[PDB]
Write a protein that binds this ligand. Sequence first.
Ligand SMILES: CCCCCCCC/C=C/CCCCCCCC(=O)O[C@@H](COC(=O)CCCCCCCCCCCCCCC)COP(=O)([O-])OCC[N+](C)(C)C
Ligand SMILES: CCCCCCCC/C=C/CCCCCCCC(=O)O[C@@H](COC(=O)CCCCCCCCCCCCCCC)COP(=O)([O-])OCC[N+](C)(C)C
Ligand SMILES: CCCCCCCC/C=C/CCCCCCCC(=O)O[C@@H](COC(=O)CCCCCCCCCCCCCCC)COP(=O)([O-])OCC[N+](C)(C)C
Ligand SMILES: CCCCCCCC/C=C\CCCCCCCC(=O)O[C@@H](COC(=O)CCCCCCCCCCCCCCC)COP(=O)([O-])OCC[N+](C)(C)C
Ligand SMILES: CCCCCCCC/C=C\CCCCCCCC(=O)O[C@@H](COC(=O)CCCCCCCCCCCCCCC)COP(=O)([O-])OCC[N+](C)(C)C
Ligand SMILES: CCCCCCCC/C=C\CCCCCCCC(=O)O[C@@H](COC(=O)CCCCCCCCCCCCCCC)COP(=O)([O-])OCC[N+](C)(C)C
Ligand SMILES: CCCCCCCC/C=C\CCCCCCCC(=O)O[C@@H](COC(=O)CCCCCCCCCCCCCCC)COP(=O)([O-])OCC[N+](C)(C)C
Ligand SMILES: CC(C)CCC[C@@H](C)[C@H]1CC[C@H]2[C@@H]3CC=C4C[C@@H](OC(=O)CCC(=O)O)CC[C@]4(C)[C@H]3CC[C@]12C
Ligand SMILES: CC(C)CCC[C@@H](C)[C@H]1CC[C@H]2[C@@H]3CC=C4C[C@@H](OC(=O)CCC(=O)O)CC[C@]4(C)[C@H]3CC[C@]12C
Ligand SMILES: CC(C)CCC[C@@H](C)[C@H]1CC[C@H]2[C@@H]3CC=C4C[C@@H](OC(=O)CCC(=O)O)CC[C@]4(C)[C@H]3CC[C@]12C
Ligand SMILES: CC(C)CCC[C@@H](C)[C@H]1CC[C@H]2[C@@H]3CC=C4C[C@@H](OC(=O)CCC(=O)O)CC[C@]4(C)[C@H]3CC[C@]12C
Ligand SMILES: CC(C)CCC[C@@H](C)[C@H]1CC[C@H]2[C@@H]3CC=C4C[C@@H](OC(=O)CCC(=O)O)CC[C@]4(C)[C@H]3CC[C@]12C
Ligand SMILES: CC(C)CCC[C@@H](C)[C@H]1CC[C@H]2[C@@H]3CC=C4C[C@@H](OC(=O)CCC(=O)O)CC[C@]4(C)[C@H]3CC[C@]12C
Ligand SMILES: [Cl-]
Ligand SMILES: [Cl-]
Ligand SMILES: [Cl-]
Ligand SMILES: [Cl-]
Ligand SMILES: [K+]
Ligand SMILES: [K+]
Ligand code: NA
Ligand code: NA
Lengths: 470, 470
Amino acid sequence: KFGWIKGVLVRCMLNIWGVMLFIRLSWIVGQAGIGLSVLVIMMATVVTTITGLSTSAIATNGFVRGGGAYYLISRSLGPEFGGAIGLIFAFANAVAVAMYVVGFAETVVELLKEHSILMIDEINDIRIIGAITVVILLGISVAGMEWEAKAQIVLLVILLLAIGDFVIGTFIPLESKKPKGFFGYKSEIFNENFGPDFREEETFFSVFAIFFPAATGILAGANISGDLADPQSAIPKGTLLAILITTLVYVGIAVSVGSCVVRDATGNVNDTIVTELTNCTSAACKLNFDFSSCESSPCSYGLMNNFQVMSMVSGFTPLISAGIFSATLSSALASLVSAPKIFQALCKDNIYPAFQMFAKGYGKNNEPLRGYILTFLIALGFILIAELNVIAPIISNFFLASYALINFSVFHASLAKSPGWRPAFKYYNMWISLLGAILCCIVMFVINWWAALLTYVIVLGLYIYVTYKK
Amino acid sequence: KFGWIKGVLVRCMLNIWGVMLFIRLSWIVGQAGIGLSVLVIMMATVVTTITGLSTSAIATNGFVRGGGAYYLISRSLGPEFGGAIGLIFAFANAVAVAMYVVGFAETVVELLKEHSILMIDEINDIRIIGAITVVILLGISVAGMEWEAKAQIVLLVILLLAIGDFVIGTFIPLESKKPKGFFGYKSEIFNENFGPDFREEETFFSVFAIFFPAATGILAGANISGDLADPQSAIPKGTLLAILITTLVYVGIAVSVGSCVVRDATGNVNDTIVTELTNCTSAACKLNFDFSSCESSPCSYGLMNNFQVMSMVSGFTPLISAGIFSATLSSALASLVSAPKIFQALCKDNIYPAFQMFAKGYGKNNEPLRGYILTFLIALGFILIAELNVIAPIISNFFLASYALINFSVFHASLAKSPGWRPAFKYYNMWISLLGAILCCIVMFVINWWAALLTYVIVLGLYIYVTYKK
Ligand SMILES: CCCCCCCC/C=C/CCCCCCCC(=O)O[C@@H](COC(=O)CCCCCCCCCCCCCCC)COP(=O)([O-])OCC[N+](C)(C)C
Ligand SMILES: CCCCCCCC/C=C/CCCCCCCC(=O)O[C@@H](COC(=O)CCCCCCCCCCCCCCC)COP(=O)([O-])OCC[N+](C)(C)C
Ligand SMILES: CCCCCCCC/C=C/CCCCCCCC(=O)O[C@@H](COC(=O)CCCCCCCCCCCCCCC)COP(=O)([O-])OCC[N+](C)(C)C
Ligand SMILES: CCCCCCCC/C=C\CCCCCCCC(=O)O[C@@H](COC(=O)CCCCCCCCCCCCCCC)COP(=O)([O-])OCC[N+](C)(C)C
Ligand SMILES: CCCCCCCC/C=C\CCCCCCCC(=O)O[C@@H](COC(=O)CCCCCCCCCCCCCCC)COP(=O)([O-])OCC[N+](C)(C)C
Ligand SMILES: CCCCCCCC/C=C\CCCCCCCC(=O)O[C@@H](COC(=O)CCCCCCCCCCCCCCC)COP(=O)([O-])OCC[N+](C)(C)C
Ligand SMILES: CCCCCCCC/C=C\CCCCCCCC(=O)O[C@@H](COC(=O)CCCCCCCCCCCCCCC)COP(=O)([O-])OCC[N+](C)(C)C
Ligand SMILES: CC(C)CCC[C@@H](C)[C@H]1CC[C@H]2[C@@H]3CC=C4C[C@@H](OC(=O)CCC(=O)O)CC[C@]4(C)[C@H]3CC[C@]12C
Ligand SMILES: CC(C)CCC[C@@H](C)[C@H]1CC[C@H]2[C@@H]3CC=C4C[C@@H](OC(=O)CCC(=O)O)CC[C@]4(C)[C@H]3CC[C@]12C
Ligand SMILES: CC(C)CCC[C@@H](C)[C@H]1CC[C@H]2[C@@H]3CC=C4C[C@@H](OC(=O)CCC(=O)O)CC[C@]4(C)[C@H]3CC[C@]12C
Ligand SMILES: CC(C)CCC[C@@H](C)[C@H]1CC[C@H]2[C@@H]3CC=C4C[C@@H](OC(=O)CCC(=O)O)CC[C@]4(C)[C@H]3CC[C@]12C
Ligand SMILES: CC(C)CCC[C@@H](C)[C@H]1CC[C@H]2[C@@H]3CC=C4C[C@@H](OC(=O)CCC(=O)O)CC[C@]4(C)[C@H]3CC[C@]12C
Ligand SMILES: CC(C)CCC[C@@H](C)[C@H]1CC[C@H]2[C@@H]3CC=C4C[C@@H](OC(=O)CCC(=O)O)CC[C@]4(C)[C@H]3CC[C@]12C
Ligand SMILES: [Cl-]
Ligand SMILES: [Cl-]
Ligand SMILES: [Cl-]
Ligand SMILES: [Cl-]
Ligand SMILES: [K+]
Ligand SMILES: [K+]
Ligand code: NA
Ligand code: NA
């Protein structure tokens, strides 16, 4: 089978490290400050850590036999909690597929813009590339899965190499890169970038909703709990270590990109300030550059305007593009196999008879082709809207709802003293799980109150329907 | 004992008819349109009608013995729903006391301003008068309750006389009243006032939130269900007829004041337009008055600026002041006797052991003096804030919460097929109750999302605590 490392840690890191690490973290650091983005990352880390503690408590309760995160949750805490969590998580993964594919397509379109290869329009090209990508990924999922075990390590190595390449690039200031920002590690840039600089229609929690899908993916290790040799011990430590490593990398990258790149920058070489005019207080002014004229007009570079800041900073640019592709495609593929399997397992249990027609599977491996079609349609529908910053809040809402369900389910089972609930995890507390559920609920209401209200209305309706069923 | 007219209908109408009907309905008609105010009244009427159907189902379920709405709810529908509903309703009545007393104090200060009798400040005078009024009302509730049976009829007669006096006043246009608006029943004024004219920080639901406490008070007939001769027949028809009559009066008054008084008006006599300037399209311009110059400056008269439009329109001004006092004081007294009784009944059941110290009662009639002190403190604290337009949304939030609890609890009992749930009401449907609960929840999030979220988190915490208790 799979050892704890290759079965939980690698998959969790690959699912967590997705689209926001490379093409949105720098923008988040620009919009907030360095310290305030550290606060955002810490809040997401607290949410995912409490959810991971709850998930480990679920894993340590019961028997090894049985695979899938929905299976463990349903056999541990109630048909009603199992069904609600499974449905919400399946929808969350289905829309996460779209978010990751849109990030990949945006990166591809940005790379094509360098060669001036435009087919119809930037948004239209993003839509076309996303549709092609999701079709290809669905074909890969339904046809080729034996290569996945060998490809996980390759993708993780490529992503780590891209991260190291960016970190190396931050330590090599270049004169050519200076007009586009990236003056190197300077105290002036750190001082300027420490405070928030939110623009119009940008707040702390909008940026948090953009970032939060980065922290998601912690349930990748539990999704193949059956495939693990010792799921009761592999899942807890694997998930917790993956959360720790990804959070440390996020914090380090945020601080580095905030301390090495200015918020606003032009892209023209002959912008130097030989004689200071009125003693400009900007960090770029102290670095012999004049970006004061940029803020009046639209800027095309800097933390606030360029989503490919990390690609620019890195010494070997195509490695980062491979890293972006690796991260986005790995996360999209992980979410594209998690949702159909969860939906099929939910339909086998016949929790909702309306969805029972999706229980049919085809092939030797019992592939949920009907479920695959449903998740493909959901992902495609969310790809026809081709903005990462509008899709990401939806991902945040649904993953926060799933995490609140998991935390509240374990807390309610501990409080009710359910006969089948006796977790063996040492670091699980029912009150910390309740705190995590409350935090997720409050955060998802703060991000978007009506979307959250609709989510809870649906969740309560499903819970009541399953509770009172024939 | 008490019949359905003097025991349900009269008290329900007296509790429903309060501060808004007299000092905020004209302002609501000004802010919204005539049609939009009619829509507001219809939405409130739908909410209260569904809640009344649920309450009638509760009343028809069970046995006659036992008094108080909380008693019927708890005996019919669980200890958990009963306790949550009782606590939320007690808090709602405690803050409604403050709302009604603040409205009375605002009317008193407005009357005193005519004689230029100012003690400290308008807000400070409102606060002082409200504190004195709530102290006197608490003393009345503690000591004198035998007069109340003979006082309900007198208060209702006075209020109806005030309503009729206003309606008569609308039919007697006067030259002296014309500068302050009130040009009589004219088609020009109706056409102008039909469309919304919301000001800054005023929306449909903020106006709805301000109006909604007017429609509340439908459970006053149920709070003395023990005192009724035949509660299972007295409560349903009495409550429904009271809702119908009050809604018809609200609609008629709204249409009348919108069709007889202009939105903005000055207060100076020599404002006449002998020759039209640029063919002014305002209704007042067509009525030989020039209020165009008023819109640039702050206006002191009209629907938008005067809260005592109905007092001005009526032929006998002191009668309306008696009507305002009668309505406000009757509703405040009803809430101030409902809240302590419900809290004491809740504390007797020992649903929440933290509140058990409030179960003690003094006197021959077992007056909850400890409970009276708590509601007096809550009302006083909400009187220290002396704006009706800010207290009223809180009242809307908490009464909508109580109504959603009642509707959802009866729907859940019907769905769960509880052993003690077998309502005899012919016009009760569980799906209509569920729709009413959903409507109340959605409306209370629309009015104020974080207040509604806090209320529902508290309600869920209470429900879970009672469910899993020793
Ligand atoms: C903004 C985002 C942050 C969220 C803010 C709110 C965070 C609030 C978080 C709250 C978490 C609770 C922390 C209590 C810690 C006590 C430690 C202890 O030893 O107690 C002990 C007993 O004593 C108790 O039972 C604890 C009392 C819990 C009551 C909770 C109120 C909060 C509910 C919601 C408040 C709503 C707040 C809104 C208020 C308007 C432990 O209990 P036990 O039973 O012995 O455990 C054994 C179980 N076992 C046998 C299975 C092993
Ligand atoms: C704080 C207090 C105030 C709270 C109020 C706040 C408002 C919150 C409101 C919360 C809403 C909760 C209402 C419960 C839902 C109805 C459940 C039900 O009746 O099932 C019944 C009917 O079943 C059906 O008729 C069809 C099943 C529909 C699935 C359920 C709703 C899903 C909502 C999402 C839709 C997603 C699609 C839309 C989005 C794309 C089951 O059949 P039965 O025979 O009647 O049961 C008897 C069984 N017994 C005999 C064993 C007992
Ligand atoms: C997508 C969907 C996501 C859903 C998640 C998102 C929603 C999350 C919603 C979460 C709602 C919060 C639930 C909390 C549960 C209560 C804890 C409890 O049960 O009793 C605890 C005690 O607790 C106390 O002794 C304190 C008093 C009661 C606690 C507070 C309820 C009021 C909530 C705040 C009011 C503040 C008022 C402020 C006024 C200004 C446990 O004590 P025990 O002795 O161990 O119990 C033994 C019982 N047993 C033997 C059966 C085990
Ligand atoms: C929030 C989004 C919606 C939430 C989920 C929707 C949940 C809907 C889920 C399931 C729908 C229920 C289907 C009923 C069939 C189930 C079996 C059954 O009970 O038969 C029923 C047939 O009743 C009907 O067939 C009428 C259909 C009712 C649909 C509306 C419920 C309110 C929706 C609100 C939408 C608000 C929209 C927003 C408003 C602002 C028979 O029951 P009964 O005979 O009537 O009971 C008599 C009891 N008695 C004997 C004591 C008198
Ligand atoms: C999906 C179809 C639903 C149809 C049924 C419902 C009919 C439509 C119902 C209500 C319709 C109301 C439309 C908006 C009109 C303005 C309202 C307003 O006052 O602003 C408020 C919200 O409004 C917004 O934030 C605007 C953004 C659009 C969100 C719209 C409500 C979604 C309802 C989702 C329904 C989920 C369940 C769905 C059930 C099917 C916020 O104003 P505020 O100033 O921030 O408040 C602060 C208060 N304070 C100042 C005192 C602190
Ligand atoms: C305590 C336990 C019990 C649970 C009850 C807890 C109750 C909650 C307590 C508190 C809730 C906060 C109340 C603030 C009132 C502002 C009103 C307002 O402006 O409306 C807006 C406020 O929603 C926002 O988006 C604002 C978020 C940033 C502002 C931050 C201030 C502190 C919020 C820190 C709060 C977290 C505290 C710590 C938690 C981590 C909403 O309208 P909108 O955003 O324009 O609509 C967006 C729609 N769209 C996305 C489609 C565009
Ligand atoms: C924003 C949304 C607005 C609407 C929600 C507003 C809050 C609603 C507040 C109160 C409503 C009342 C609870 C809901 C209906 C429960 C009915 C039920 O199933 O009973 C069950 C018990 O229930 C429990 O054991 C604990 C309750 C957990 C319900 C959790 C759903 C989480 C969704 C959270 C989504 C909302 C998150 C809230 C914060 C935003 C089963 O009971 P039984 O089978 O009869 O067996 C009893 C055996 N006994 C007799 C021995 C004990
Ligand atoms: C998850 C762990 C780390 C506990 C964190 C709890 C609090 C310490 C966090 C949760 C919500 C955070 C708040 C969320 C929103 C804001 C608004 C934010 O204001 C801005 O948007 C920037 C305005 C400006 O300074 O220019 C200031 C930080 C603050 C108060 C945050 C302060 C820190 C808070 C209270
Ligand atoms: C893969 C990630 C997640 C973990 C590994 C982290 C390394 C990629 C980082 C951490 C410390 C960094 C080093 C910190 C200090 C330096 C010194 C710095 O200066 C030089 O040695 C000479 C530079 C030159 O002239 O080229 C060169 C980059 C380097 C090795 C950095 C290379 C990249 C390092 C090893
Ligand atoms: C992916 C993660 C796990 C590894 C990356 C973490 C570190 C390699 C980065 C992140 C934060 C960076 C620090 C951010 C700020 C500074 C201040 C900087 O100070 C100056 O040189 C300016 C002072 C001056 O010369 O005047 C020294 C480099 C340093 C420590 C950076 C060193 C490299 C750090 C530690
Ligand atoms: C039996 C009846 C009472 C059922 C009512 C259900 C709907 C017909 C009601 C419920 C919510 C109402 C809506 C609540 C909020 C608004 C926003 C409101 O916006 C404005 O204030 C526009 C101001 C302007 O015209 O300048 C317009 C009315 C409307 C759509 C209302 C239209 C009628 C709605 C949909
Ligand atoms: C909640 C209850 C109190 C509502 C009762 C309705 C009456 C108060 C309204 C409904 C019809 C109205 C009547 C409609 C028509 C007229 C004719 C009208 O004739 C005149 O203009 C006489 C002029 C004058 O007397 O100087 C006098 C008002 C009056 C009686 C109105 C008086 C007030 C009435 C009776
Ligand atoms: C407490 C309530 C139930 C008492 C009943 C209310 C009626 C006495 C009021 C409310 C609406 C009023 C109506 C609102 C608008 C008009 C239009 C108005 O039209 C004209 O005057 C046209 C003449 C012109 O301007 O040339 C005639 C009076 C009338 C029917 C009003 C008659 C008196 C009404 C019915
Ligand atoms: Cl991501
Ligand atoms: Cl996840
Ligand atoms: Cl009122
Ligand atoms: Cl009421
Ligand atoms: K992720
Ligand atoms: K009322
Ligand atoms: Na990834
Ligand atoms: Na009254």
